[PDB]
Design a protein around this nucleic acid. Structure first.
Lengths: 77, 96, 48, 63
RNA sequence: GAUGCAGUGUACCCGCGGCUAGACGGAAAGACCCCGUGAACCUUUACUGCAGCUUGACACUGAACUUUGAUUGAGGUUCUAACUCUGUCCCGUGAUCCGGGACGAGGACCGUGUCUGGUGGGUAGUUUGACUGGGGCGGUCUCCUCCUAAAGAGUAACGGAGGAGUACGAAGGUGCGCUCAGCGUGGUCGGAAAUCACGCGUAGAGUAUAAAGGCAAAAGCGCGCUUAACUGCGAGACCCACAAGUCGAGCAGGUACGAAAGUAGGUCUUAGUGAUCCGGUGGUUCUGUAUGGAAGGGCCAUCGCUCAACGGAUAAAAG
RNA sequence: AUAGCACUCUGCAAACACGAAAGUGGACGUAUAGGGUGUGAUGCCUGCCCGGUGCUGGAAGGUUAAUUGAUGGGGUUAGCGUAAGCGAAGCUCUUGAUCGAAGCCCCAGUAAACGGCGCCUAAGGUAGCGAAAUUCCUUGUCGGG
RNA sequence: GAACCCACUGUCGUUGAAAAGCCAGGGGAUGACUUGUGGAUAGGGGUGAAAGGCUAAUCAAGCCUGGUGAUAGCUGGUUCUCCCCGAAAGCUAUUUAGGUAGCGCCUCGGACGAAUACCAUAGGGGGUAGAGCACUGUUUCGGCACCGAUGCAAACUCCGAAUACCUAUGAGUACUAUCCGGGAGACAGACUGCGGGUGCUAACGUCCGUAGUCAAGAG
RNA sequence: UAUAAUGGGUCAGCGACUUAUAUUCAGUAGCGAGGUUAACCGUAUAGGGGAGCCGUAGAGAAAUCGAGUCUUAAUAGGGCG
């Protein structure tokens, strides 16, 4: 006989690009995510595909905040 | 050369573009510093051809500002850019 | 099946946009306001 | 004998000061579905990649 | 699968007659099997062409008398002068060929040249994919989601398990407003299960579609007005052998909604697709072979058949 | 292969074969003869099917190649007008009205033509034979040796 | 049934007396018979009582010469000496799978100079090992779809390391890192240890990730 | 691969990266913002022959302009210099 499986999609290369304590310039992408695993904070923008990017020069920082416990990523100038 | 193992080659997976201008093959460009090769103070198509700074079959020429000249030249029938004309008048030449 | 259609400017500039339409659900023609860059003003575009 | 140019490549590549220039593919027929951004950005001319510069030189010796 | 390597046993040096257990003994670059984008010959309702056969238009091709149909061409009956005779006679000529003359039988037919439709294994040139625990048969060939995958990215098997080749002028934009589903009590023909009132716990509801990651400022649900499902761009980043792919602040012009700060360069996101050559359409202060035009070409926008063996041998092909 | 048998073609400048043609064999023959095809002395014989393919005849009903060229559109050129922006012959580029045979479609016959002989089709094996040069299960069952 | 013409059985011979024979048997032998001499048919042709037979020891397309030095991604071979460096058997695409092309890996020249590496310190994300039942599914025993206890999971998760990875500062030790250009080879790997799919927790089996060795390395 | 995988019985002689043209890079020499002739003439490696080629300026499909140019309504922004 023959198997009816044997298919998979191409890789997408999702994940974090800039970690905490790193210096970034305006426009740098910080996180690539299929959903909102991380939420934008101060000086961080959100794209149509949920990508997070920097809107100002500074240093990246990660935190946990809010009632829901949402993880946030921000940039400190 | 150019064969890549069977996949469509670079020169055949890109579109052709542009058309060739006939008058461009007869148009000529002349640097201002080359006018020193001209014998005499008359700068024209005939004199440039004689000096061999312009090929014989060319039908028109243009002077552009590249270098520096130190003589007065009277230019007849040759197109001049603003800088080339300014340099000629500064050196003491005239146009027409 | 959706059919490809054009929207042509009413100003005579010849500018046109392209889109798709469902014929059975939209028997009639389409009119819509759009920007025309040749005259630099919002004008009506009609189906074609 | 004289080296001969590959005319197909000659019709696809023009010479610049420091390299070669070309247009982009995917702009011929299937265009309605494509987004405006792709149309705008993919319109124009781009430079040849260094990985292919050697091949282009071999194909077009006289430019 | 060892006379030649390790251990160990045996064996003084050399002929002659006989034997074939071994020296993967000699002999022929395996014919069996697979491969090469090798060869030959054969078959056909594989592809493509030609000879042959067959249809009609024009030319060789003429005259007279006549009929009928939608000025016109379609016929009928005669004639001889083109033309046919592998029919008789005479001459060159003592010649079954050939030529000339006379007659006879036919005759504008037959047949020949150019063009053209059909037929055409008679003949000729070719084609007939790859993966594969040998080949064949079967299955598969492109894209998306999860696991394998060893807590960054990436990671194979004819490994396990499912989707895609779309839909929407609202299912888009904006302003304003609202929360699901499930249980417990009462009521009409309505009860396991219809609609309605209150109370309990709690996202198990929903998100056009497969799954994952997400969703309260709800990304879920409703109404009013509308077309930003715009044009010209674009600092800076992700991903990648190339060809390609993806995110995006910000500037100018014209808008939609809102009192206003402001939001909008299509839809919660990730699949819904096809390079190049040739051809069609609209615009074009580009070019256009002596000159002014035009044809053709270039540039911007766009469309179609095919390439699913889905980086697509020549858009034509089996045994 | 064979004598015998059957089908089919050939009216003579025969059919058929060779050749590029001229011409040659067929044949110095003439349907009781010549070519092609199948079967294979002789005895008894030779069932059904024309649906498919092929061949033969008829029909003139639809389709159209060359040829032919009614219209329609485009380029250039004349001439009036301060001013509209107009548009004639000629030359020339395109379009395809009509006419225009076959082939094809249709009807009928033909099986000693190819071929077929299980509710459905064109019809589903007459004589005869049979584990038989044809039987996988098979060293089928019984009798003789 | 002799001559003559054939070739049914067996023995011998197989570097033979012989590139098709000898010996003992065998068949036809007045016929569609056998035979001498001379002549006709020439290669995609001829001839064939039909075997793809014969056509000068050659036949599913004779022989000689010419195109001609045909093509072959295939096999073999490739000749004196010394010094320095030194790979790979991977990814992507391919009528592609034992070929080739781009990148990765080697060598040489030029432009630059710590911008590089080892370790320490500081910041940072995670969802694997383990563990668990709070979702999904499944499992056993008791009391009223529910409750108590009990167990399981690659495609379950209330949790969750060691390592690995990114950035910043620094001592010491090492000519490191980067760019441009000239020349390649290579794209059949093997065993072993660890974490795994497949197989039978089989294979000197097969397919990945990771480290050592061989390949190309003697003692 | 000692392999029981291939080739060689032995000796002497013969036997395989070349030639022409074009182009790219490197070394070396002349001249230097310039360098250099081809055919051809020339009792001829001399001398003559400047037609032609490379360099000296890019941008744009092109007209065109020119240290700028293309795109655009834009002396915005961006690309190539």
């Amino acid at each position: 006989g023959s198997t009816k499986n044997g298919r998979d999609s191409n890789p997408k290369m999702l994940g974090v690009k800039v970690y905490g304590g790193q210096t970034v310039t305006a426009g740098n992408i910080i996180v690539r995510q299929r959903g909102t695993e991380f939420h934008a904070g101060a000086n961080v923008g959100m794209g149509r595909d949920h990508t997070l990017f920097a809107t100002a020069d500074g240093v990246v920082k990660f935190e946990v905040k809010g009632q829901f416990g949402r993880r946030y990523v921000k940039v400190e100038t | 050369p150019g064969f890549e193992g069977g996949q469509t080659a670079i020169y055949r997976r890109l579109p052709k573009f542009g058309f060739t201008s006939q008058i461009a093959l007869k148009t000529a460009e002349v640097r201002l510093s080359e006018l020193s090769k001209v014998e005499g103070d008359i700068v024209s198509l005939e004199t440039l051809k004689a000096a061999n700074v312009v090929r014989r079959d060319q039908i028109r020429a243009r002077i552009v500002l590249s270098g520096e000249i130190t003589r007065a030249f009277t230019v007849q029938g040759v197109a001049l850019t603003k800088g080339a004309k300014a340099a000629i008048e500064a050196a003491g030449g005239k146009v027409e | 099946m959706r059919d490809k259609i054009r929207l042509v400017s009413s100003a005579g500039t010849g500018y046109f946009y392209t889109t798709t339409k469902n014929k059975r659900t939209m028997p009639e023609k389409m009119e819509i306001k759009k920007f025309d860059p040749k005259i630099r003003q919002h004008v009506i575009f009609k189906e074609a | 004998a004289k080296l001969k140019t590959r005319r197909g490549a000659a019709k696809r590549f023009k010479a610049t000061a420091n390299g070669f220039k070309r247009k982009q593919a995917f702009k011929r027929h299937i265009l309605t579905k494509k987004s405006a951004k792709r149309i705008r950005q993919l319109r124009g001319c781009v430079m040849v990649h260094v990985s292919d510069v050697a091949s282009v030189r071999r194909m077009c010796p006289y430019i």
